[PDB]
Design a binder for this molecule. Structure first.
Ligand SMILES: C[C@H](N)C(=O)N[C@H](CCC(=O)N[C@@H](CCC[C@@H](N)C(=O)O)C(=O)O)C(=O)O
Ligand SMILES: [Zn+2]
Ligand SMILES: [Zn+2]
Ligand SMILES: [Zn+2]
Ligand SMILES: [Zn+2]
Length: 509
């Protein structure tokens, strides 16, 4: 009675998705779509709490051996059942060296038995600690107790894929070929323009799905996206131009949202070669970024300075104060000069750097401003390069850029999601930071069984990141979005921004 006749949605995503295969996805452009096409053992509600997915229950006596009960009537988009074996197959495939998954390490973070040996080729994938006891009963064996293990199963990397589909060949993820178990099915795609999905009528909870079509529109120039939103072509954006914020608040109050998100923006230094291999160069660079200037003037949509890597909002985290947070920029800038001269740069040998970022107005403005801070305080010159998301994600692992722009949004709500990114066994370690003390302190944290004791080690880890500056944290994210008043059910207050079109609906407008 309150619902519109046409239950169709146009959703903006910032970039063209790199891959719709859960085991080859790495960032939010893909991931946003994958959550409509596939479904894990569990989902997240709007508060970020764990709720039933394929599983209706999950039990553990010791937080090490976990048993999931699956629903009888979970289905793939081809009407076949979703089974425990599907998961066995999909998680072996995640760790299988043949897959080259950029999330293989996630199975090791979970502590699933034998994950690291399999990733390293020392054990076969059937040695993984995951068993189908029957079609509806999946039993997982972890190395260590992990109270939040179930949370990890809401993460895309643990979504099931269908073997027969996967084994039909390299076009399996094309429109009309891709068979997943989520609320929607891929109907149409044109590269760089649109992805269109309609409901999987076999999805167990299809009775509740409202939206009959959702079109995702990738547009990496935030101005062009907001322009289409104001014109009425887009019902919800991802981000918006920072310089339009006050005018947006003014013209469309109620549609502008900027809650705190579990993610951090940062620059990665090459710790392995070039000038950035010297700890003093890195520290000078990081100290010279004026974080309150950035968040106040260049951003101003509620972002906070990142003095530590892990976001303040992260459940279980009580940071110790940083000594940079308490200094003035003047002090910071002068120490930075001292450090760089000790490194041996100045008029006698000026510092030249390359920086990669992925195409975006925001990243371009932040790069210009960082480069200005460095020019001005340290006499550094930076050659900028921009590349679209899908190309950036490979160029950055090439060892070729002194500075690389990036973010990390948490795969679950606990500090290890952040701090493990800098361990030597983590594929997403862009700086190639390889510090045995650092690795060992996080391995210890994972054996601890109180929040306080874990937090002491996570603090020790953050200290090493301050001392060695392999990366420069810049800011803590907000989930900046424009949402039309008639779009309901978007989980705008989920700190991880985990959303499924199946919760959304359109009111008469
Ligand atoms: C998903 C994984 N944990 C991860 O963080 N991957 C990151 C990439 C994660 C990723 O897509 N960030 C987005 C986050 C944007 C947040 C959004 N509110 C905004 O304000 O724009 C980005 O940079 O635009 C990696 O591979 O580099
Ligand atoms: Zn049965
Ligand atoms: Zn069918
Ligand atoms: Zn803090
Ligand atoms: Zn409309």
């Amino acid at each position: 009675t309150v619902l519109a006749e046409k239950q169709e949605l146009v959703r903006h995503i910032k970039d063209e998705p790199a891959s719709l295969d859960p085991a080859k996805a790495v960032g939010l452009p893909e991931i946003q779509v994958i959550r409509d096409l596939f479904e894990g053992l569990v989902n997240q509600n709007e508060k970020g709490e764990i709720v039933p997915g394929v599983a209706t229950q999950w039990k553990s006596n010791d937080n090490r051996i976990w048993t999931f009960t699956l629903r009888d009537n979970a289905k793939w988009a081809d009407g076949t059942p979703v089974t425990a074996q599907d998961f066995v197959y999909s998680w072996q495939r995640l760790v299988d060296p043949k897959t080259l998954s950029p999330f293989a390490w996630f199975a090791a973070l979970a502590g699933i038995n034998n994950a690291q040996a399999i990733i390293d080729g020392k054990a076969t994938p059937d040695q993984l600690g995951v068993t189908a006891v029957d079609a509806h009963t999946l039993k997982i064996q972890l190395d260590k107790p992990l109270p939040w293990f179930v949370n990890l199963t809401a993460n895309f990397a643990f979504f099931p894929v269908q073997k027969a589909n996967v084994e039909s060949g390299k076009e399996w993820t094309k429109p009309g070929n891709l068979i997943g178990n989520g609320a929607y099915v891929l109907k149409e795609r044109v590269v760089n323009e649109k992805l269109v999905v309609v409901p999987n009528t076999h999805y167990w909870d299809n009775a509740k799905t409202v939206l009959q079509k959702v079109t995702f529109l990738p547009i990496n120039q935030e101005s062009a996206a907001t322009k289409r939103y104001l014109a009425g072509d887009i019902d919800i954006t991802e981000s918006f131009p920072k310089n339009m914020y006050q005018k947006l608040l003014k013209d469309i109050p109620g549609q502008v949202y900027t809650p705190p998100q579990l993610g951090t923006y940062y620059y990665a230094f090459n710790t392995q070669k070039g000038p950035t291999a010297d700890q003093r160069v890195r520290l000078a660079l990081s100290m010279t970024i004026d974080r309150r200037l950035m968040t106040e003037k260049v951003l101003g949509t509620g972002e906070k300075p990142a003095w530590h890597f892990t976001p303040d909002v992260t459940a279980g985290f009580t940071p110790e104060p940083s000594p940079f947070e308490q200094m003035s920029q003047e002090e910071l800038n002068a120490q930075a000069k001292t450090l760089l001269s000790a490194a041996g740069y100045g008029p006698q040998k000026p510092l030249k750097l390359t920086l990669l970022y992925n195409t975006s107005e925001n990243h371009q403005k932040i790069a210009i401003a960082v480069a200005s801070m460095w020019k001005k305080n340290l006499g550094v010159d930076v050659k900028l390069q921009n590349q679209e998301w899908k190309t950036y994600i490979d160029s950055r692992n090439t060892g070729n850029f002194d500075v690389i722009r990036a973010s990390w949004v948490g795969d679950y709500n606990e500090p290890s999601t952040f701090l493990t990114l800098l361990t030597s066994t983590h594929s997403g370690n862009i700086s190639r930071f390889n510090n045995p003390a650092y690795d060992k302190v996080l391995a210890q944290a994972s054996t601890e069984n109180t929040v306080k004791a874990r937090n002491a080690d996570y603090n020790a880890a953050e200290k090493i990141l301050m001392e060695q500056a392999p990366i420069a944290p810049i800011y803590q994210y907000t989930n900046g979005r424009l949402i039309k008043p008639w779009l309901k059910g978007y989980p705008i207050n989920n700190p991880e921004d985990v959303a499924y079109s199946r919760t959304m609906y359109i009111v008469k407008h």
